[PDB]
Design a protein around this ligand. Sequence first.
Ligand SMILES: NC(=O)C[C@H](NC(=O)CP(=O)(O)O)C(=O)O
Ligand SMILES: NC(=O)C[C@H](NC(=O)CP(=O)(O)O)C(=O)O
Ligand SMILES: NC(=O)C[C@H](NC(=O)CP(=O)(O)O)C(=O)O
Ligand SMILES: [Zn+2]
Ligand SMILES: [Zn+2]
Lengths: 310, 310, 310, 153, 153
Amino acid sequence: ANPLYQKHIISINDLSRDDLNLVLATAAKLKANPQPELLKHKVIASCFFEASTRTRLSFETSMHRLGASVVGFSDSANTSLGKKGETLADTISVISTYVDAIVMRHPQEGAARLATEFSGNVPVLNAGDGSNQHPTQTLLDLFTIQETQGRLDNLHVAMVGDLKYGRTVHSLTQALAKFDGNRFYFIAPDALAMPQYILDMLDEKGIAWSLHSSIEEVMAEVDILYMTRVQKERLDPSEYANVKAQFVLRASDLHNAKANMKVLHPLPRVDEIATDVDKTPHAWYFQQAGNGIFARQALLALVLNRDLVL
Amino acid sequence: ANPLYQKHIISINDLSRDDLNLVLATAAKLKANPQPELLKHKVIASCFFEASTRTRLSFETSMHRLGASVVGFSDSANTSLGKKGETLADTISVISTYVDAIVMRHPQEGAARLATEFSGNVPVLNAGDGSNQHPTQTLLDLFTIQETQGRLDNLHVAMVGDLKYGRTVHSLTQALAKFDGNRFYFIAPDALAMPQYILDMLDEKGIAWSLHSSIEEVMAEVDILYMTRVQKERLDPSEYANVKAQFVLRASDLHNAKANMKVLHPLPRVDEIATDVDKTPHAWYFQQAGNGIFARQALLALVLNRDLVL
Amino acid sequence: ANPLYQKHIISINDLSRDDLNLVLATAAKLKANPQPELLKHKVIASCFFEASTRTRLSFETSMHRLGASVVGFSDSANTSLGKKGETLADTISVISTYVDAIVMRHPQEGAARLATEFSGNVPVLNAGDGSNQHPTQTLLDLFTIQETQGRLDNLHVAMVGDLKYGRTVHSLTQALAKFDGNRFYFIAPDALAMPQYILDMLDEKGIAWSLHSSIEEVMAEVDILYMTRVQKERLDPSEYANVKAQFVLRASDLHNAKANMKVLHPLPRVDEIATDVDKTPHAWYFQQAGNGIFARQALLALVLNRDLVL
Amino acid sequence: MTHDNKLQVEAIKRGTVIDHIPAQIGFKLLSLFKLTETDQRITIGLNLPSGEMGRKDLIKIENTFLSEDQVDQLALYAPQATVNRIDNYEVVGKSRPSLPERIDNVLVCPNSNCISHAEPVSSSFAVRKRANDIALKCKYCEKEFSHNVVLAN
Amino acid sequence: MTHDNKLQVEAIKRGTVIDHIPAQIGFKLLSLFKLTETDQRITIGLNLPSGEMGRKDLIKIENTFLSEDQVDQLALYAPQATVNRIDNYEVVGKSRPSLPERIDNVLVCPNSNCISHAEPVSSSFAVRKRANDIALKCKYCEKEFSHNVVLAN
Ligand SMILES: NC(=O)C[C@H](NC(=O)CP(=O)(O)O)C(=O)O
Ligand SMILES: NC(=O)C[C@H](NC(=O)CP(=O)(O)O)C(=O)O
Ligand SMILES: NC(=O)C[C@H](NC(=O)CP(=O)(O)O)C(=O)O
Ligand SMILES: [Zn+2]
Ligand SMILES: [Zn+2]
């Protein structure tokens, strides 16, 4: 039984450097030698209580790629929790009696954690819970950073945008902090600053991090420029000043960019990334999105299949 | 050709004690020896024009469990009947030219009956039509009552909640009335009383039934306590007094409960069943929900497959 | 100075038979001897936070007939309390520095009383506060009864309809109970029965009252048949079964009526009084409404003039 | 000067002693009377034996005395309670809570449509011993309620 | 065994005594951990001298025993307090509260968008000594707040 067999995947905080590497190694194996029937006879719920394009579609595509069936919803409005006032707990208790695994994205923080407490032996995979964690994003992200940098340690990484609400950066930062000597640059409005529990975690690990006001200010020495979208749906009216993208990467800002340098974005992007950046050799957010296929097939293969893939 | 092959499953009123037993027997067979490819090459429509969690998800999960494909919608809002003003009849006439069977839940009473008149040779399975019938619920219910009681006859059964609008009790009562010597206790607000056509049907069969004001009043002698949710969505403003749960089973009400006694609920539950009841040995509504898998696989196997499963 | 000079008119429960009579004797005189310049140089505020046709317009007209100026609003949507979040208290505090008196109707019970706590030396007249009191209604009702009957003692009065939320019958019952030998007949749905604090009051006074579920039961002995409208705007959803008028008065139900009986109604009426009743000599709600002019002229003069001599 | 009667005996120099407080009520008084807010020696006895009165609660506050209206408020919360003014040890003012005419501030009108809620005014009800229970009418909405229903803030 | 100031009370047979509770804390302890909710005899002393401390509170519960964990739960309010297990009128065990690793049910997550509010689950926080005082991380939303702000229901 591989390390992740039948495990909940709720927060990167619960994953070790070893687990992450296991997912990526498996990902590389599956990309090279696909196993179409690996998860045949499996039925997996795809329960999205909040909007999503890449996370739900890639997750489902992965399920089919491995021979599994899918059931679920992309909107809770027509579920019994939506029109009959059913608790999320009761919703999970019944669904866990039908499927072999539950993938879910929810508007509240901790819903994935909640569901694991009512899902019995059925494992829960977090497709994102509020502004908290986004485990499978971090996985595809790591797969991408390695694919382009050749390593996951000793990298200079700048995270731009809304760091307070971005579940993307929350998980990613903690994930990279489990690797040796990565440098962190946080560029964000003062209102959407990276949370304290992340900074403290870094300090504790002796990880080096600094705050900056302009992108270019660190453009010359960054290996990965992680752009993020201002989470409008999570802001509170007293933060509506930060709704508009504050840092807008433009094609002309990549003049003194390290050759290896790559632009990543969990997506979707509003205007934080001009479209003129799309064709520069630094843009890699679309390649990043597609890698979500190999990373999500990998996690599923490890959670639902007992033996370690070859 | 088994008795139910290619038959519409619209109302328990059209089913005989024999048919019910055939479904349950098949259910037990499939649970013991699953047939993953039994319905391969079949495509079935899952058309829910009204909200649902267990009925749609379990139905679909069953379809995949047997190797069939699924197409459909969980909300009519984006169908042509939803944005172009198409009649339900026309909707059925076209869908029946694509699929091998149609499973549908609708807000109006008799919609399933309606669809059978426009579906040609394609069988229609009623996932619930308004406040009328809920055939497949009764099936899983019966499967559950037997699993826990060991029989479907000579049982004392109390049905609590909204009996006027509950399509669940309507079908279940008629189903149990086809068995010998079951006793019925109806506990409901005077406004949501069990309908006349059910009482008359019982009287005619010499079935014994009585009305009660308190649960406990019959707690000592009930084998099955069937709790139901007040159907808010079906009430008319002049009945809005009964919206709030009137009978709230609590863990402390099961002190003098028969050992075999079991609590069932079609779900979802609002507050009619406190969560402290969840861990008592009497609670069985979640087991009940999961049995919906064996019962729905059974019906599908009987309607779409010609030979009687072994 | 007359007994009512500068007094607030919040609730009948704060007035004596002598006060009521004073108002009625003045009304009788003003109706026969108009004083067009009695309130010259006075400015009264008409403030309605709730819908109104008779009360407001009659009140405002009464002011003009007396030569006073009116200022106010029939809707609070455009006051600063509607758009800027101002308290009712502050609203009363500033308006009381402009006008000589304040006539106000409000949705919440007790608003007229709370206003008197902020109007300093400015008298407040309660045009209706929630489902509590409607003093000026009672004053005109009494004036009408006294004109058509020639007495306020030993009467047989029936109050039909919504007696619970009817501020009109709450004030009228208390008033007539200050007189001698009146007998009350209450005809109202169970859910909208005459409040207990009025009955306890009737018992304490040793007055006869009795419940009836039919008009025909009392038609023969009543001197005044006071019909009321179901206070739809005040009903709690758990009482939406009562919106439709339970008791509907048709012209044909007046066959056993005493020749001198009069059908009164605060108005407006929905379906509780068929239009065919309007042509009978019993219909008296419109003449009643008209008496609002004399009643309110009377009150306004007694509260704003130290001495009245005509 | 004496010691006591029941098993456990106590003694304070100056202050108030509320005795014969019904069970599960004593602690409620500590709350809605902010008695605990003081910094004077306080002593509480919960579920103590009262003899034939089953069980009682008892509070003791050194150098402190209750406002009449708290005994007036006590009349609705513990009519059988006994507030004793103690000086230079042992009583000097043993009184019994009398039902008042009105209660202010501490109560909340159960009528949800009472202007008293939305606006900045202090509550006020009128106390009237009815059949057997107590009834109180709101100064604003004029509705009357069983003091049992009103004691649900 | 107890203290003297004219032969004082506080002498139970079996139960637990929370000694050396900080001043002004004993009332909240009774509120937070709902300690008065019981029929067992309870005697409380508020604002009494201790020498070692300026003033201190004391709670004695009868026939009631606290686990080593229930004792730690107090670490957040009465760190330097002592819990004596009393049996046969004699103190058969003394313990000092240790910083617990998690606080359950009692508190309520300050994060409005936490799923713990809406759903049928008990609150839970990890207790971190964020040098400068205690830091609490919600098991659910994973956000951490200072003890000082994580209110209780
Ligand atoms: N939405 C974002 O800005 C970042 C991140 N985005 C995704 O996962 C892609 P999607 O919303 O599933 O299409 C998130 O959902 O937190
Ligand atoms: N909804 C209920 O209260 C009972 C019954 N419930 C179900 O079938 C479960 P769901 O609404 O499909 O999740 C019904 O739909 O009639
Ligand atoms: N509205 C009623 O049915 C009774 C009574 N009606 C009136 O005063 C007449 P209006 O609403 O001023 O036109 C009231 O407002 O309480
Ligand atoms: Zn009130
Ligand atoms: Zn939280």
